[PDB]
Structure formats: C-alpha cells, structure tokens
C-alpha cells in the first residue's frame, strides 16, 4: 500500500505515535517519507546482509525475523513479512521499541539526515487530524 501523506498521518495518530517519546507525528511521517516514500511495501538489502522492511524500514539484524539474517535478533517478536502489510500496526509497535532504547529516532539514519531539525510540522500541514 502507498499512503498519501495525511492518510499515514492519521493512521499513526491512531495507533498511538503521535509524540511517542516526545516525537510529533510531523518527525514520524518525515521518517516514513524518506525511509519509504510511504510504501508499505518497502525493501532495502544492505551491505551486512540485514534487509530493512515497510514503512520505517526497519531492520532485520535486530529487530524482526526473517531467517536470512545469521546472527540477528527479533526484538519485536515478528516475522519481518508483518512489516510489509496495508496495516501498520506492526511498524508501528515495532517502532516504538525501537525509539524507546535510547537514541530515540536517531536510530533511523535518514530521519538522522533528513528529517532531524527541520520543519518536520510541513509534513502533517493541512491534514485533518
Ligand atoms: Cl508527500
Ligand atoms: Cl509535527
Ligand atoms: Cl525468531
Ligand atoms: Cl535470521
Ligand atoms: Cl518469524
Ligand atoms: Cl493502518
Ligand atoms: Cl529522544
Ligand atoms: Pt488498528
């Protein structure tokens, strides 16, 4: 599924990460732009052989599984396919892990690169929230 802009907005004020850990839902939708240009079905293979899945790509050496990871972790306790589908519940409770243990969303380079100290606002301007 690819979102428009407000539809992600809502569909993350509706499961509770609008300032998740103090984050505005602005810094959320900004992350999910650059991280999958709001394609929920978002893939991205790196270097170390981890993938990164869905609408915050989120990554395999840690936080899902996918069987092809030697080595990883599955802190979020789910396949990492549950990433990819129209519904974001699972981002989304698999994101607030990840922003809860310690470098907030920092641990999203592109938000790091693109999103951190900007006009994150811009990004849920004009939506009906
Ligand atoms: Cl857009
Ligand atoms: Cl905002
Ligand atoms: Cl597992
Ligand atoms: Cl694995
Ligand atoms: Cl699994
Ligand atoms: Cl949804
Ligand atoms: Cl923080
Ligand atoms: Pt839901």
Same mark, same amino acid.
């Given at each position: 599924?690819? +979102?428009?802009?407000?539809?992600?907005?809502?569909?993350?004020?509706?499961?509770?990460?609008?300032?998740?850990?103090?984050?505005?839902?602005?810094?959320?939708? !900004?992350? %999910?732009?650059?991280? *999958?240009? +709001?394609?929920?079905?978002?893939?991205?293979?790196?270097? @170390?052989? *981890?993938?990164?899945?869905?609408?915050?790509?989120?990554?395999?050496?840690?936080? !899902?599984? @996918?069987?092809?990871?030697?080595? *990883?972790?599955?802190? =979020?306790?789910?396949?990492?396919?549950?990433?990819? &589908?129209?519904?974001?519940? %699972? &981002?989304?409770? =698999? %994101?607030?892990?990840?922003?809860?243990?310690?470098?907030?969303?920092?641990?999203?380079?592109?938000?790091?690169?693109? =999103?951190?100290?900007? @006009?994150?606002?811009?990004?849920?301007?004009? =939506?009906?929230?």
């Amino acid at each position: 599924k690819v +979102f428009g802009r407000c539809e992600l907005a809502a569909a993350m004020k509706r499961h509770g990460l609008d300032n998740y850990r103090g984050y505005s839902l602005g810094n959320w939708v !900004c992350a %999910a732009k650059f991280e *999958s240009n +709001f394609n929920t079905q978002a893939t991205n293979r790196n270097t @170390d052989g *981890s993938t990164d899945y869905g609408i915050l790509q989120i990554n395999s050496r840690w936080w !899902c599984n @996918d069987g092809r990871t030697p080595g *990883s972790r599955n802190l =979020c306790n789910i396949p990492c396919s549950a990433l990819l &589908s129209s519904d974001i519940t %699972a &981002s989304v409770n =698999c %994101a607030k892990k990840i922003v809860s243990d310690g470098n907030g969303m920092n641990a999203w380079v592109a938000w790091r690169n693109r =999103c951190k100290g900007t @006009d994150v606002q811009a990004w849920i301007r004009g =939506c009906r929230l």
